[model samples]
Target: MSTPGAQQVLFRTGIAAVNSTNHLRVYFQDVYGSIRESLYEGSWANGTEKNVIGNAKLGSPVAATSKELKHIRVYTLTEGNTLQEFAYDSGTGWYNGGLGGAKFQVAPYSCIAAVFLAGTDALQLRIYAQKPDNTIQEYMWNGDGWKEGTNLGGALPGTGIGATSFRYTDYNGPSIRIWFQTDDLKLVQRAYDPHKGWYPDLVTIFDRAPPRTAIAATSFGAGNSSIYMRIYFVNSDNTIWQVCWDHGKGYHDKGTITPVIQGSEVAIISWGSFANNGPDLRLYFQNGTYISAVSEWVWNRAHGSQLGRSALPPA
Candidate 1:
């Protein structure tokens, strides 16, 4: 086993989703390197206990669900540098699959992003990863078997990578977008369109930052194509910064939202809805040894700003 230190790979694998049973399930890698999940069995106020589901040597795990298809899937990189997938159904509980051998020899520090793409009648399960060669590779499973990994060009700098499938109500219907820091220390983006193949454009989102600073990307809105795509990262001074992009307007930096202590790891998830007093953002990070904090942020459209801070749960 590897010892815990700066050089150790401490990747984070987690996601929030509403299962077919309408339960809020949060899946993450716990401190013991096991895959544990928390499900909202009763009520949010009642809280839920986490249960171990699987074990993984790497921290980069991602999940996706499809109500239309009626299934939930989780993907992770195993200690052997291969890809492992855990699937769940209401009746089957959980099952595992692998890519076999060194076919998926990914880098130690990397992120895996999966999404259920409903481009055609059949729902496609697409997975993205930063390959060992620094280029972005993609794999798709169309209900039957896995497809070949398509090589998307770009030299990803570190483990700072993220990806998601976006479906626009008007503009582009369904597409894939990936964000990563390039070898030159600049934030770069590459996208894929089903009809147009792979777009050759490598758009730079932001300039360079401190070394080994992780990044996360997510979108939230009033339950439609019109949404906010925000990117979060820790600056050199241990301060958190966010920049967002909109459909009408271009990119805008929201500046430093808060300051986190040095040597901290950050993860984020957003809620999307249309009803009043709905849709918020949750930011989780480890402040110190064994001390994790959660912050909730709600956007105030009247003032066009975000409000909230970290706090303890009510007693």
Candidate 2:
């Protein structure tokens, strides 16, 4: 399709995490793109409408607890305008929950917080926190009217089951990696590590039967120990499967889950190879017109081999 402006191939993009200013929280479909962690200037937006109504705020997004890249707390969409985060001018704007204003709204407020540590609140979806004075706080999800922040009293119920696909890690500050659907249905993981100083490690990396559901995790670079996840279900015959995970090496597609996309909203972004740059890893998926790829595995394949295959319009 690629003719909203006409560059071509805009329907595939991937890179689930990377903040601390290194900006790289990408996903494509409803919309999501950012790249400024040394990769160079970035911007590609759109995606919010499920739980946090509106008003649009999203401030302090510089790398909320940066483990290398894991700062996702910016759902500020005012509708007609107003997505300010750090500095249209205030003291310094441009923060998305790494320690700024931390606003909320994605049409309905799908999720806003859950990074409980030490004491135990345990929810962790994409929670945002930043306060020494800078300002930024988000941790919503209880339902109706909404207002569930400040629980940090020591929460411990931990059982959304599969929690409906999740992932996160700070390597330094915040840490999470949820993946739900458990009541017995199988598939679990609820790790949350927020001690404030150290020793904050709530664990559980597996429960079983986790193939794919709400996938998008990051940390697929450098020495590359391995940490990449992505998914979008619907298969039995329904047709619609986009999964990826390299962690332990189980879910495979872009070589192990990330090289195939189709409808609903396929937005993703992984790194390691801009082409010949070589370390081996490139799984992007953006959808509006088209944009796909597969630089590691090799199966159904579709974005044209592993390089700039453009396409846009839908932002």
Candidate 3:
């Protein structure tokens, strides 16, 4: 392997896949206080060490999402410690999103969750972060402009959160979901429906998210057909767990992911088709080692496996 320019141990990883071509990008931060992007088609052999943005705070949780083939966006804390956006467009290439532009502030180490809603009604990209007071803060883009959305209070200080959206059709499912832990470690759900506005604090979970671990979330199946929601987190036992929901089945805990993993952050993404019908899912995290090994778990709708490890850029 060729040596990478990384100068410090990395923190938090974010994974985003552009469905059109199965291109995957992993974003991470280092002790050097910056964020970097690694590309993989099937391996790290594809590419690594492209700076997504610099002057990011060390340990700033990374979150990323895409407008499918059109755009890719990444979020983290600036050195001065406010949420910032780094983005790419097919036409103009990458540009700094510069969210809040110092007007909006968040906890430097706050877990960030982002989702792109592609309804014809409005092409939206939403970013979720946390305040020092532990409240969840929201910034949004509705295809037209960027603005602050509503805020939700009563989060566990330093806890992680996950965000995702769904649509039934062009008019849309109009459903948006956010997941996070409460002060008591209860996994809470805050949802949005166009007709109903926002639903706050649905604390009906049996799983206690390990205090302040990044939560990974994504939807499977066709939005117009059947959609499934999966949220992943590492528990105190260091085992990866998922809390899932379907329209018919409500919420439940399923640990189909295995083999005792350890990391402050975990990222999950589902893309394209598995065999012929169902979507395939991939999980990424630091293996239970000191080498900063990036390991993966793959579920092809029928079975899943921990496919060993992939190397990160040299520290």
Candidate 4:
């Protein structure tokens, strides 16, 4: 907005979500147009591979984190109508034969929920929490292999790879679910429920309004440790916006935002506007006061090429 800042457009250009390990893994559309994965690599290093998968971009990636590294799951799009997922020490890089590679996929969106269960007794995760590898068992394969618990239906409802995010809480049951934005930008939530034992139908939290374009989300504790979902979307006007919700508060549109740090801030603010350049997607933090971009492995730097810096709103 306000005349672009001092930073270069070449900042981190990828989509990242925090793992249960508290580390960041970034995803970006690569040269081949496929999403590539990079670890936060080394904190804020300007030059390095931050993604663990080594420049591998995922199809439709939705992630979930747990206190223990092994419990974190990276759900992605694989070849075929299939989906693939894997789990490893969320904290470290690679292990035996690269990552603790595992495959998981779901039947089309027709199936229920796709899960990644733990392995057989013979083979187990080498490192994890004090307890046995907390990975799920009984996984189904969409492409790689989808993990389905006893009752979560075949997989969660809704089609493949929708805009997604996760949340967990102690009182409401320690569980994580996906919040996907329909092509129209409507918001829906789905997750595994142990009691009913089937992927519950998507619960639409917000509908109508401009469609949600490039996006990111995370769960945070507020007032009494309750869980809240923070979601970001790019409007048709290229104006960045956000919505926050909890079963209690409902969906609240906090309104337009501006990015800090020095840089065109154009790629991020004007994300989802241009197809070729920086969708330069990044996530918003608490109340949308400030916006931050992902590292370069994700995308190339875009000055105001896509969205004229002159077109930005006042800071």
Candidate 5:
């Protein structure tokens, strides 16, 4: 560990599988405000320690798992609004592209999310920002090149809304799904498939999202070669609410979840087989009252909701 400084901590995490072992990576700003990354090689067990990756004073990083390429692709916005990327593979170690050769202009605080478009075997990354006209605008990357920006046609942009993506691998083959909360607090979804390509219009699913909060979504197998998705968001009162959809059952609200911390920003992740348990959704968030204190709450199809909360790691 290095000496501490007077800077605040900003961090993001992503998961990947290497050498048949699961690895969790965290990218954060150090006390001196330099961008740094660390990896938990196999598991966050007693013998595990941070394997520090190099730093270059870049911006906050977002990552997506590339199972087809067997690499984890990480993107970040560096100084001068430069959008850059690099990949980490078990065989070749870390591969850097410097500043990515192109300067992508984005709002300094724009939110970024990425996903692997299955079947197509392409990596797609999206950057979401509140445009000058107060509408949500999106820019995308299709592995090889960047695409033109598209206005999401939403009114009254606000901060704290984020985007997440997942792949649907049930029947109908595999398709890429993107989800985001609009400026008006509505939950919207759009998809791309090999047959149809990108959907022209964003589909509004939830009429209202908890205002100015983050969202997390995931999908899991439901047996019989079918799958279901659950999307979680904070309500206006900071209570957590979930909306779910399946090929057969359709969409419905799952009501509110009971967490130890109220009115907190939540993030969710799913593991198909965690500790031999079936597919499970793990939600992570910090206590609104004590913003520095973080905890984890999990939900599973077989076990319902499980309570497991702990403080975040030290800075």
Candidate 6:
């Protein structure tokens, strides 16, 4: 991997809703250099452990999400710095591309993030990756087929990227948010709307010094009462930092919400919760070279007693 020091690739735990129950799916490069998808179904313990396979360039960072239309897509890099797509559809089973695949060249040290939107008739999908020049390129697949290169145009070659669509109840409905650390180590946010397209500006910086962590994001609260969106990152010391944009409170930097941890990247998800009546949050990172889970909002109290480690290490 082209990452710095002993740090790992941008491989992260992917969250997607499948089989009617919200499930967590993690993709990574196995020891054999083949890409593997580990499905954590009903329960991490016995929920079901069925693994799938694909071939990729060793250490290809993976991003995946469900289209909510009985389909899920996984993005990875293959030979010649090509982006290859592996997909799972309920009706057609699993397949790697349609023969030649939707291949696109990426940056030498590129990491990717994928997301989906439902408004379109065919459920649009967007994949963002870094180009050789350190700028971001948005690859869009709107219903019919793949369209490459939107020229997102940003600096910072190795910043782990993240893109999310959330409903800011205070606003009209839902929109897209993408954030990454700049080449100068400063953080920035860019947004997109179906009508207005990508905003020429950003949301906020929340200061710099962000670790090379994936800016994992998730939104909670379906109703207006408790809706909020969080943009999460890490500090050099492995502390947790998240910027919260609540319905009424607006956006604010919540730096270092947790103490020293052990991990190169953080993966978070908001799952259905019977107690909360909406969704409960869980954050995952490496603990002693293994994936450990922590419930957000309860970070401090349970760090010493976090969930057991499950998934393998990244990179």
Best by lDDT: 3
Each prediction's total of clashing residue pairs, residues at least 3 apart in sequence or on different chains, is 0, 79, 2, 43, 0, 1
TM-score of 4: 0.48
lDDT of 6 by residue, 109-202 (tens): 6888877752333567778889888888888776667887467777576777777765434455456777887867777788876567788886
Better of 1 and 5 by lDDT: 1
Which ranges in model 4 have alpha carbons more than 4 Å from their true place? Answer: 1-14, 19-23, 32-43, 46-52, 55-73, 90-92, 95-146, 149-172, 182-185, 191-203, 209-215, 222-225, 246-248, 258-315
TM-score of each: 0.75, 0.27, 0.86, 0.48, 0.70, 0.77
Candidate 2 structure quality by residue, lDDT tens digits, 153-259: 22212211111122233343344444333334343333443454212343323333223222323333322223444433323232334445556674656323432
CA lDDT, candidate 1, residue 99: 38
Error of 2 at 233 (Å): 26
Q: Which stretches of candidate 6 lie over 4 Å from their true place?
A: 1-21, 45-50, 98-100, 119-121, 167-174, 222-227, 257-263, 272-276, 289-315
Can you rank all candidates by TM-score, best first? 3, 6, 1, 5, 4, 2
lDDT of 3 by residue, 1-315 (tens): 322433344634443333333556766665566566666656554223455455466667778887664778877777677788888878887778857464577776577888887454345777888887878888888755777788877688877788887765533456788888888888777888777778754755545666786677887654444458888877777777777777567786566465444554778777654336556777777654444545567766456454644454433
- For all candidates in order, the CA lDDT equals 0.56, 0.30, 0.67, 0.34, 0.52, 0.59
Q: Candidate 1 on 1-315: residue-level lDDT in tens?
A: 222321121333343333323244545555556665544445432111235566777455544444332466767767775667767766777766543333676666656666676344556777777767777678777766777557776655444656656666554457777777777777767777657667888887778866556666666552244556777777876877787776557578557766665744455555554344534455544333223322334344334345343321110
**Model 6, poorest ten-residue lDDT window?**
1-10
Ranking 3 against 6 by lDDT, winner: 3
Quick one: best TM-score, which candidate? Answer: 3
Q: What tens-digit string does per-residue lDDT give for candidate 4 at 62-123?
A: 33222333444444444442434344453664333222244333333221122222212112
Better of 3 and 4 by lDDT: 3
User: What is the lDDT for 202 in model 3?
Assistant: 76
lDDT of 5 by residue, 1-315 (tens): 221221133322221121212334434444343434433454332111243343433434343344533666656556655556667765987776433675655555544455544444454555554544545566666656666556655543443334444444444545555567766777887665547766787777678865555565665553444456777767765566777876577777567775434445455556564326666666655443233334456576677786644433332
Segments of candidate 1 deviating more than 4 angstroms: 1-23, 40-50, 58-70, 98-103, 118-121, 171-173, 221-227, 261-263, 273-278, 289-315
Where does candidate 2 have its weakest 10-residue lDDT segment?
155-164
Q: What is the C-alpha local distance difference test score of candidate 1?
A: 0.56
